[model samples]
Target chain A: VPDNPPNEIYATAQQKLQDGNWRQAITQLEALDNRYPFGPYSQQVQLDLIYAYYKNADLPLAQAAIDRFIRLNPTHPNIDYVMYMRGLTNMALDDSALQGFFGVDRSDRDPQHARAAFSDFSKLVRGYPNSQYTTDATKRLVFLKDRLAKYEYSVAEYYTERGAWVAVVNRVEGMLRDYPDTQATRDALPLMENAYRQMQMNAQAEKVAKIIAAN
Target chain B: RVVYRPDINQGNYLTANDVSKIRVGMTQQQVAYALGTPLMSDPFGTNTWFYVFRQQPGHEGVTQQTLTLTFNSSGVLTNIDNKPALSGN
Candidate 1:
């Protein structure tokens, strides 16, 4: 008899997924892909693998799978989902839900994942405006943009607090120019005002104070 | 005019109740579903999840808290670090 057919394995995996048996679904999907690397169901198998890994909270595995899928099928019709999932995986990299639960501020942490998530969601929104995931992607992008701006502002605040007036000015000025229209801007002005005063730039301080007052 | 203070609650607020719901033998999904996603992934570490919370500064009587849950290589929750020992309960 021939080896187990691709259809049989794919069906089994699908059943496991429908049952919410994510672990078993992963096992079955991996077996199918391993046995039929170039078979008819290969692309579908890869997509399912990404979903299963994501649902299982195996984020690294999910990222790897999505990256592979994108590399192999750049023009796939459902590429939006791929990008959305990629954005989500990156967004979850510096997981904030757990931190948010405790009210801890994440502005001090590295914004590496935040930047990547911003880029991914931007690509998705630009490429597939009508994608089902576009709305959520847009919201996440805004959240990430504000977070990134806040991270920059937090660093500037640190510099100001430590009496590094020049550093604070450079950082805050760059933030105002580069990251306009973020929630951090509301805080950035006062920060700039303080740094300018500390540096004895009374004219600049008054300018910033006026701006803050106007807001 | 009156000054306004916005309620700023951030991070995963893991509580004693959530921690108590976790057991050593649970899967990562079960633990994740119970306590929510971790605050960070230690890329250099093994299968460990970190849950953290803090009340933003400027709030009165605020505090910070963190919990670390670890699953062994086999994906079974094998360790709960930084938690008060509940074995005698």
Candidate 2:
């Protein structure tokens, strides 16, 4: 269909969409688009459909609908979110995967997963740096860095377990300098201190030890 | 002696009696409370507070008076000056 259906159908569909009844609204709007083939509401139907897909948690479908809207309404007011929704919807999908597997350390809940999310979020922020979305995206980017820090500590723990003092020292130093605030820092700091003591690296151990002692 | 708000024709010139006890650094709010809202304030910033009283030209040099108090940043009374009423003969 090229156009939206009659105003009656579109109106009812709009009401349903407003009421969060995406299934019914989509059915109505899509029907209008198919029947009218080249109707007055054709472009609008596509716009509403794209939003419906996002609201309904239908990520892939939402993405496709948005792509279609971008193609049709390249200059639309929400053209920015054409790119933003791509990242934000992906976030909704990925967050579901990160529901659990939280580490005991204070680091992020999921380092690897969060890293992936960060990369996706970064694309949008960098692509639209001056946009208002940058405010929220920047906050999430910090989170991504912290999460990656936790991942580092996880590796440091592996070194600590194997008594690889050198490896532990390098990772611990990285955490202190780069990821000081992550959950892994809690255990990693003490572990590095103890490793330094075992290796007779008194000076190195003392610095890390001071941090543990202070807390 | 500067009549800030010429629009308000009712304001009379400040007398020497009105000039006492005024100082600088007093906030516009405090000054407004003391002498009512200034007909006009410092055009540049709120740093300078002005309380203006007007007198007719004939009474300019007569017994009429206008009081002006200027304060500083610490809200201390820095200057007090009075314009005597013109004893127009």
Candidate 3:
């Protein structure tokens, strides 16, 4: 194998990627990174593979590639980019199939991907605040928070349906602490107040009523 | 004393500072990239982008900022329908 030319293979993959044959590009990239292992094309190859896997709807593969890059180049300047990529990958998986509102809080059923994405963005913004990815990661956190807060509201709703007043208060109260910025915070407040009153906790009920009015 | 209020943020949560980056003559990708893409998918041939952010990120005071960006045939941003209003906390 007298053909260890780095740029040759790298250039070919880049063309296919630009030409929208990400599948072909990915096939070339995986072994290209493995055999070469480390070179001028090394970091770029791994990074491109993550992007290709994500675009191809190969989420777990994207996640895998991201973890490997993180393990290898945790201090890489572009590590922020990989973190952001993982966030996008998890979002795609979480939001892939069946979905909706009033509502099916898929978070209740399986928030594995959603929670993973939320953590991904949270880490990117907190750890790489100065990076280019910070702005988009911050925006994504808010959007993801909305869905998660909605999940809490759904649980609170179920508690109210069965007159589980204490659980309703606790669930909504926790939601306020965790997702105070979400629309569900507003929606759950009323239920929280009702739970307080129904439980005959008149003092807190009055307080929550006024709090509700203010909100 | 039941004097308590919480932050209530709904919708896309774009701030004035954020949307300010998008200007007329900007491309579609520039707009979406500058501001986050909406949860709703942009339909084919649709040339308008609606961004609505609600809340002050603080307690008690609630407000809404509505922005409608219209693009031309070639997808250059053409107009901005911006209306910021108020509501509950």
Task: List the candidates' TM-scores in order.
Answer: 0.67, 0.47, 0.64
Candidate 2 structure quality by residue, lDDT tens digits, A1-215: 23432877788888988897788888888788877767775887876777788888788887777767777667766566666666566556655645355733435344455655577668767767687677777787786676677678778887677555555666676677776676667767787778657533355456666778887
- Alpha-carbon deviation at A121 in model 2, angstroms: 3.7
Candidate 3 lDDT by residue in tens digits, A69-162: 8998699867888888888998878867655644554656566777899988998888876888888788888888888888878878986885
Backbone clash pairs in model 2 (N, Cα, C under 3 Å; residues 3+ apart or in different chains), count: 34
Window of ten residues with lowest summed lDDT in model 3 chain B: B38-47
Ten contiguous residues with the weakest lDDT in model 3 chain A: A195-204
Docking class of 3: incorrect
Per-candidate iRMSD: 14.7, 38.6, 14.1
How much lDDT does each candidate structure score? 0.75, 0.62, 0.74
The candidate maximizing lDDT is 1
Which scores greater on lDDT, model 1 or model 2? 1
Task: Mark the 10 consecutive residues where model 2 chain A has the least summed lDDT.
Answer: A103-112
Ranking by lDDT: 1, 3, 2
Model 3 reproduces a share of the real contacts of 0.00
Interface DockQ of each model? 0.01, 0.00, 0.01
